[PDB]
Amino acid sequence: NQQDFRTPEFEEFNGKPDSLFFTDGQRRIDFILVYEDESGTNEKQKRKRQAYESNLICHGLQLEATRSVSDKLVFVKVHAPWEVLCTYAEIMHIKLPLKSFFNPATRSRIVYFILSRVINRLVSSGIYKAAFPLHDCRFNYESEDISCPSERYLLYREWAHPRSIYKKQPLDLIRKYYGEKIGIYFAWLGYYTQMLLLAAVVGVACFLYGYLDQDNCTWSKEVCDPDIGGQILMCPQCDRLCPFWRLNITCESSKKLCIFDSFGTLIFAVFMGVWVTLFLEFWKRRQAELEYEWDTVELQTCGKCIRVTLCASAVFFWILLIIASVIGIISFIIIMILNTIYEKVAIMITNFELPRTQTDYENSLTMKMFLFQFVAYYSSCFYIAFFKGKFVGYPGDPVYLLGKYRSEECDPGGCLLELTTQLTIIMGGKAIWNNIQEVLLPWVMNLIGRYKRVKITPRWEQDYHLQPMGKLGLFYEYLEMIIQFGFVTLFVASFPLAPLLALVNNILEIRVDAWKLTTQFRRMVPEKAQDIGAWQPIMQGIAILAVVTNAMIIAFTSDMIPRLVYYWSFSIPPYGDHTYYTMDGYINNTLSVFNITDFKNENPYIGLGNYTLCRYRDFRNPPGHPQEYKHNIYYWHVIAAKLAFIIVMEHIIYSVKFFISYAIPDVSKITKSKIKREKYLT
Amino acid sequence: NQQDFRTPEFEEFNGKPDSLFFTDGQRRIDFILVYEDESKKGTNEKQKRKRQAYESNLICHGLQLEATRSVSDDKLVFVKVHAPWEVLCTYAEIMHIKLPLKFEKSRMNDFYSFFNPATRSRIVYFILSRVKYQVNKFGINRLVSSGIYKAAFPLHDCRFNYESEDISCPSERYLLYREWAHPRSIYKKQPLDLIRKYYGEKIGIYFAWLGYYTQMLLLAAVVGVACFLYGYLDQDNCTWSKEVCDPDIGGQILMCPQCDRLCPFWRLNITCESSKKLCIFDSFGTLIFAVFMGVWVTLFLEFWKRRQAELEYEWDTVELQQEEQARPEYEAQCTTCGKCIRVTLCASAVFFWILLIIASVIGIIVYRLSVFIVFSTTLTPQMATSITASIISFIIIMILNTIYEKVAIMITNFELPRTQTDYENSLTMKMFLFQFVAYYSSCFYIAFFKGKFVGYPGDPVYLYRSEECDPGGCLLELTTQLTIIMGGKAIWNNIQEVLLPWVMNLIGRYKRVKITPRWEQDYHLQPMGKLGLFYEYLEMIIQFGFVTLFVASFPLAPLLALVNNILEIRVDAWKLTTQFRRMVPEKAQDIGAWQPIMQGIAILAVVTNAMIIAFTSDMIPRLVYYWSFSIPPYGDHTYYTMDGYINNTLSVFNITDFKNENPYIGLGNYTLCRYRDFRNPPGHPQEYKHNIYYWHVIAAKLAFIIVMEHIIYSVKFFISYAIPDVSKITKSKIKREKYLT
Ligand SMILES: [Ca+2]
Ligand SMILES: [Ca+2]
Ligand SMILES: [Ca+2]
Ligand SMILES: [Ca+2]
Ligand SMILES: [Ca+2]
Ligand SMILES: [Ca+2]
């Protein structure tokens, strides 16, 4: 309990390149602790380190320290004796199969438990440079020792290298080598990829149906018509800087809009609601299956309430700040710095809210960081969907909020097409660059570390010369995948190829994550986690919000409801001039005229052009009406249809989700049978 | 395992009229088994053989029994049942009961007469089920269902109204009858722990739930009375109601006839008296109360969860779940494909009975249509017709309910549930679905379908001539139907629950079935049955559905339910203590499927209330007229004002009816009649078609539904998130118990 002596067996030997055992070779290496002490502060750190090392030795562990061949840095190898392993396996209730005994991953986990109970505080307080486990060997080369398997080499050769992209994930193998946390993360990623493949095939079918019915959408032909679409002069969008422009320049946008906006897309939106429900339920089943297989289950005011609401206000205070930043912007290098900016501020809030428990801190930081990223990523999409062009008024008296003038109307192509373009960008290009940066940054850091020259190097030095995966390693990966899932599900009513883009991205993502974790990053201590954690409630909330968001997208930001309404009610004799239902004349009977009579509350139109009547895209009465520029029966019918569609789709989808969740058992039948059999035989 | 010795110390004695102990009095009585064997076709011999076998097996299991001959019926024989202390302890080890210990709570055996009589009866019943008699034959339930044993039951302390003769015997039944279960104790606190100890955890949790329901109904009723008084005080400033009452304005409103024949154009004056009380019924006070009830439902559910967790800690409702024994009917007949086919057929039959009650509702509609004319020929006639229709629908539903109870028993018997709990759940879902449809179909039809599809006076909707509603809205009719159904069901159900057991006991006494012992006294009583408090839970859940689903009609429904529950606790406790035979205590950590049912009803209630306010209420039309149709672009008034509402909303109709008959000309001599819809007035370029006002009102209704649903669901989510389902004090007590043990 005091600094009686130092670490025994203090000898230096680095001749064996891959000696995961001690100098004697009898016992392997469970951990390595890196420090530097040969050169007030120095002597105090020496005293504290010697005291802690004496405590560790007195507790029963076997440690010995060797200085680096390449001086002032010393590594201590750590191995737990058989008796210590047995007693702490009895303490920590590990499920060994009773019919080299302990797998190296769980050996390292137990040793880390010992270090925590008697480590991170010293590491944080400049005492120990590092503390880590060791890999089998170099990933691309076999282990020199034959007794010790090169499980890492096999994992890299058949699962981590890109040449093994198509091969199935050795999930049991990666669980064994890395730990239950990484295992369940990759299992969830693979199951997500499978369900993405299913939904992407269905969405491709719907997209191709719309593609086949390309020249059968009459409004696009009317758009591309040099007469019907050429004699339509849409009013200028901005004051004195935008010109009166004809709809002819929107024919390509019209074709893409026929592809992206059709009853096929509506069917895919409904199917995507159903598929989200199925995804959640079958992930529950698969997670229960993994709980059975991997034995994931293990065990080990008023003043505060004012403080609770104190930070929540600050959290809400910062959220609206980053809202305006994106809106004013409407940028990758700023985004990455934004995250550590988010990290720093979320740390501060957690600091004032810390119950000092690691899991509680994780939950709080998860919620805060997810809110920050959610806003920073989906603010532009939400604006384009719901707030862009909806509050504009009309050419007479356009809505001026303040000295800031002329809240923008929609683009010539359409708000839905712009949203689809933004989704495609953030989905493909920025995700690809995220993967490229994610795979290059650790490799570049390792390259510069080697270039600093900091010949055969032993295993501890080899692993030390690597980037240490810091706190909350898999958290960023989960955040990335959850953002991708939010893009897939929240906005799937825009274009149906989002699951296909996510499918390609995930096929690359599994390989890039595995490759970087295997090669570029120092190995972490294996842990256990029966579920993905707070990400499960986050996904459930995203799923619930997805129904509302998709229904609102279809009703408000998509013109499908106005087109359906025109077909079913404004082609009949009382409103239309056709004997039966049709869609011709849709543009001429939906676009609203406007004579040039502007309030003097400037008149940019006279300076912009020499015309008299321009046709803007809203549903008001035409000029000359007894209540001109006012809303009309057609506008109120369209708004009624939008609201009714929202209500009907919301209620039907929610009831279907309830029925599916009720009629699909949470736990698989085979899982029940195997659990019952093992309980019977055990 | 064979019949060798039976009926130990067989002696006849009844001189001690109030004694729950044996003839010697050393050991008490945990149970009584009733049979009769002395008096065909060899079946009596077979039953004697089997019963002797079972008795010998029971005695070999170590129980102690004492059989007496009935003092009245020679054939009737009672057998008193007690378990020795060693057997009690070993079976407590078998099923790990939690007992006090030095007052901490611990497992099968503690360090601390000790066995409460309820626990003794529960343990003895467990033994009786486990022990075999004999192919393999299971236990007591098979014999009882087979008619071998006539009965098997526990015993009360004494007569409810009289103290026990034995001074050493505590009269907990007498105490529960004095300070509870009696009208003079209607307004006093419930000895919940005492009634739990006497009757069981299931009975205790039911009564706790009922008391807590009354507690929350008190708050809901207070807020409802506040809003109702707001509406009643604002009665004099109801501009639309006053404008209707005005003979100068309302007297010029000649509404078109409702029925095709023999109904005159009627003025709106006769609707003034209904409108005065209608203004209280659909006003911003009722809207605020509807929102408050949307919040209060979530508060009720969350606080009941907290109270239930507290009771789980205190009463140790979590007991080890031994494997449930099969039902005798299921085991009598023992592929799975045929059983699934039978289940599908049973579901088809249930849907058939649901269709039958739907047809009954349609018949009620036809009766309303056929009786409105005669009411008009002979207190407005439509109000009288609505009241009579409510009365007749209530009577018909009550009559059909008992028949459905019987047929649901038969259906669940025909289908095969493997265990008693599965039988309970299947019967729960089936019975609740039928009760839901039967009790809420009329209210749903009146709220959402009555008058919503009528068309205009030209070309009305025929099926024929679906019901049309009143200009003030059908909220008054919904309120009348709701109050009538609710109060009538309460009164009729309490009258049944009191008289039926009491009447059965009285006729049993009249058939001569004077000093009598405890076992005979309790035998001459009505058995509870294997179901138990299922029906009371069902009744209270139906009342909760009435309170929450239709709370947007009138705010005093919680007050009516409050009075009803105050009476309900007393009637149920009184009947259970006096009228009915004591029921074997059980364990139940929750109310069961009724809590998922309540959660589903709560989720449905937001939609139902929002749709009620938007469609069946006129509040949204009044608000829209005020805020958008007094203004110059639509109206004439310079500022926002409600006046002109009636003259501006009701749509005119010139007499041009299609010949697809024209009864209006035969039934009257008038030219322009005003009906309650927003279609275009005649002479409009698109006349008798929907108008911009109509679509504006529809848009307002839909937007209000969307906003209310989303906001209220968000509030409920935030409240459920902010309110922990486990009490802080309960968690602290759990931590203290864990630390001590
Ligand atoms: Ca990525
Ligand atoms: Ca990644
Ligand atoms: Ca399920
Ligand atoms: Ca009642
Ligand atoms: Ca009752
Ligand atoms: Ca809650």
Distance (Å) from CA B570 to ligand 5 centroid: 9
Which ranges in B187-320 belong to alpha helices (H)? 192-199, 201-233, 239-245, 272-281, 284-315
- Cα separation, A353 vs B33, whole angstroms: 65
* Residues forming a β-bridge with A79: A62
Q: Which of B697, B700, B706, B704 is nearest to B676 (CA)?
A: B697
Mind telling me how many Å the CA of B671 is from chain A's nearest CA?
26
* Residue of A636, A642, A655, A659 to mutate for B, most B C-beta atoms under 10 A: A636
Q: Which residues contact B99 (CB under 8 A, 6 or more apart)?
A: B92, B105, B106, B107, B108, B109, B110, B112, B114
What's the token pair of residue B390? 């409510």
Which chain A residue's Cα is nearest to B705? Answer: A647
| Number of helices (H), then strands (E), in chain B | 24, 8
Bridge partner residues of A382 (DSSP): none
DSSP one-letter string for A527-596 = ---SS-TTHHHHHHHHHHHHHHHHHHIIIIISSHHHHHHHHHHSSSTTT-SSSS---TTHHHHHSEEEES
What DSSP assignment string belongs to A435-497? HHHHHHHHHHHHHHHHHTT-----HHHHHHSSEE--SSHHHHHHHHHHHHHHHHHHTTTT-TT
Rg of chain A over CA atoms, in angstroms?
A: 32
Residue A314 lies in a domain: yes
Asked if A636 and B689 come within 8 Å (Cβ–Cβ), the reply is no
B-chain residues within 8 Å CB-CB of A651?
607
Determine whether the interchain pair B698/A640 forms a contact, defined as Cβ–Cβ distance below 8 Å: yes
If asked whether residues B229 and B90 sit together in one domain, one would say no
Give a three-class secondary structure readout of A629-673.
CCECHHHHHHHHHHHHHHHHHHHHHHHHHHHHHHHCCCCCHHHHH
Q: What residues of B are in contact with residue A639 (Cβ under 8 Å)? A: 699
Distance between Cα A436 and ligand 2 center (Å)? 9
Window 565-594 of A: residues touching B by CB (8 A cutoff) are: 574
With CA atoms as reference, the chain B residue closest to A574 would be B686
By the 10 Å C-beta count (0-12 exposed, 13-18 middle, 19+ buried), A217 is classed as buried
Cα separation, A534 vs B654, in Å, equals: 66
CA A93 to chain centroid, in Å, comes to 34
Query: Is B654 inside a domain boundary?
Result: no
A125 and A185 belong to one structural domain: no
Residue whose C-alpha is closest to residue A421's, from A548, A257, A270: A257
A627 contact residues in B (CB cutoff 8 A): 633
Pick from B695, B706, B710: CB nearest A633: B695
Of the candidates B128, B142, B135, the residue with the CA atom closest to the CA atom of residue B328: B142
Cβ–Cβ contact B395 with A under 8 A: no
What would the two tokens of residue A295 be? 């034995």
Q: How far apart are CA B295 and CA A564, in angstroms?
A: 38
Residue A339 lies in a domain: yes
In angstroms, the Cα distances linking A302 to A306, A308, A309, A539, B428 are 6, 10, 11, 32, 44
Q: Which two tokens stand for residue B618?
A: 């006129």
Residue B600: Cβ within 10 Å count: 12
In a domain, B641, yes or no: no
Which ligand places an atom closest to the C-alpha of B726? Answer: 6
Q: How far apart are CA B369 and CA B103, in angstroms?
A: 68
Residue A475 φ/ψ, nearest 5 degrees = -60, -45
Backbone torsion region of residue B639, taken as left when φ is above 0, otherwise alpha when ψ lies between -120 and 50, otherwise beta = beta
A643/B699 Cβ within 8 A: yes
Same-domain status, A441 and A539 = yes
Q: Does A316 touch chain B (CB under 8 A)?
A: no
Subunit contact A646:B692, Cβ cutoff 8 A: no
Long-range contacts for B249-254 (Cβ within 8 Å, ≥24 apart)? Answer: B249/B646, B249/B647, B250/B646, B253/B471, B253/B646, B253/B647, B253/B650, B253/B674, B254/B670, B254/B672, B254/B673, B254/B674
Mutate to test the interface with A, among B336, B628, B634, B695 (most CBs of A within 10 A): B695
Do residues A208 and A128 share a domain? Answer: no
Q: 3-state DSSP call for residue B9? A: coil
Residues of chain A with C-beta less than 8 angstroms from the C-beta of B728: 301
Q: Tell me if chain B has a CB within 8 Å of the CB of A267.
A: no
Q: Are the beta carbons of A208 and A202 closer than 8 angstroms? A: no
Choose the closest CB to A574 out of B633, B686, B710: B686
Rounded to whole angstroms, the Cα distance separating B663 from B465 reads 13
Asked whether residue A83 falls in the same domain as residue A186, the answer is no
Half-sphere exposure of B199 (CA within 13 A, CB side): 26
Determine the residue of chain B that is closest to A640 in CA distance.
B699
Q: Is B254 inside a domain boundary?
A: no
- Find the CB nearest A632 among B692, B705, B710: B692
Tell whether A123 and A188 lie within a shared domain.
Answer: no
| Residues of A whose CB is below 8 A from B689 | 574
CB B713, CB B606: distance < 8 Å: yes
Flag whether B680 is in a domain.
no
- Cα dihedral angle (B64, B65, B66, B67), rounded to 10 degrees? -170
Is B728 close to A301, i.e. CB distance below 8 A?
A: yes
Domain's final residue, options A115, A132, A149: A132
Nearest to A643 among B689, B702, B710 (CB): B702
Amino acid at B367: Y
Chain A residues with CB inside 8 Å of B699's CB? Answer: 636, 639-640, 643
**Best B599, B692, B710, B712 residue to mutate vs chain A (most A CBs within 10 Å):** B692
Q: In the block, which residue shows the tokens 């422009």?
A: A245
- Residues A198 and A93 grouped into a single domain: no
Is the CB of residue B692 less than 8 Å away from at least one CB of chain A? yes
CA distance B646 to B268: 10
Q: Could you tell me if A39 lies within 8 Å of chain B, comparing CB atoms?
A: no
Question: Closest to A627 (Cβ–Cβ): which among B633, B695, B696?
Answer: B633
Q: B706 to chain A, minimum CA–CA distance in Å?
A: 7
CA of A630 to the centre of ligand 4 (A): 56
Same domain, residue pair A59 and A196: no
Copy the structure tokens of residue B608: 């139902």
Answer yes or no: do A548 and B710 touch at CB < 8 A: yes
CB neighbours (10 Å) of residue A448?
A: 10
How far apart are the CA of B646 and the nearest CA of chain A, in angstroms?
22
Decide if B420 contacts B327 (C-beta within 8 A). yes
- The count of domains in chain A is 2
Closest among A525, A482, A522, A526 to A506, alpha carbons compared: A482
**Dihedral angle of Cα A91, A94, A97, A100, to the nearest 10 degrees:** -80
Tell me, in angstroms, the distance from the centre of ligand 2 to residue B87's CA.
Answer: 65
Q: φ and ψ at B28, to 5 degrees?
A: -85, -170
* Main-chain dihedrals φ then ψ at residue B392, nearest 5 degrees: -70, -40
Domain that holds residue A43: 31-132
Known binding-site positions of A? 438, 477, 480
Q: Hey, is the C-beta of A564 within 8 angstroms of any chain B C-beta?
A: no
Rounded distance between C-alpha atoms, residue A398 and residue A406, angstroms:
7
Q: Residue A468's beta-bridge partner residues?
A: A522
Planar angle of CA B673, B372, B257, nearest 5 degrees: 10
Enter the DSSP assignment of B184.
G
Pairing of strands B64-69, B104-106: unpaired
Burial class of residue A264 (count of CB atoms within 10 Å of its CB; 0-12, 13-18, 19+):
buried
CA A382 to chain centre: 17
Name chain A contacts of B692, Cβ cutoff 8 Å: 632-633, 636
Domain match, B604 and B519 both: yes
Contact A204, A264 (CB under 8 A): no
Among all ligands shown, which has an atom nearest to the Cα of B573?
5
What is the CA(A66)–ligand 6 centre distance, in A? 56
| A221 occurs within a structural domain | no
Binding positions of A for Ca(2+) are: 438, 477, 480
B151 sits in the region (left: phi over 0; alpha: psi -120 to 50; else beta) called beta
User: Is the same domain home to A332 and A434?
Assistant: yes
B536 marked as part of a ligand binding site: yes
Select the residue from B678, B702, B728 to test the A interface by mutation, using most A Cβ atoms within 10 A: B702
Domain stops at, among B153, B179, B210:
B153
Interface membership of A632 toward B (CB under 8 Å): yes
Residues A487 and A381 in one domain: yes
Phi, psi dihedral angles at A577 (to 5 degrees): -105, 10
> Which residue shows structure tokens 């005011």?
A301
How far is B627 from B645, CA to CA, in rounded Å? Answer: 12
* Final residue belonging to a domain, choices B621, B639, B662: B621
CA of A339 to the centre of ligand 2 (A): 15
- What is the helix (H) or strand (E) element at residue A614, kind and residue range? strand A613-616
Q: Which of A627, A637, A647 sits opposite B695 (nearest CB)?
A: A637
Determine which helix (DSSP H) or strand (DSSP E) holds A252, and give its type and residue range.
helix A251-260
A402 is a domain residue? yes
Q: Is B532 left (phi over 0), alpha (psi -120 to 50) or beta?
A: left
Do A126 and A184 fall within a single domain? no
How far apart CA B265 and CA B665 sit, in angstroms, is 11
Distance CA A370, CA A376 (A): 10
Q: Structure tokens of B553?
A: 């009609």
Question: At A62, which amino acid appears?
Answer: Q
Q: How many A from CA of A282 to the centre of ligand 3?
A: 10
For A240, list phi and psi in degrees, rounded to 5: 60, 0
A498 alpha carbon – ligand 1 mean position (Å)? 14
Rounded distance, CA A327 to CA B554, Å?
Answer: 47
Please tell me which of the candidates B686, B695, B728 has its beta carbon nearest to residue A640. B695
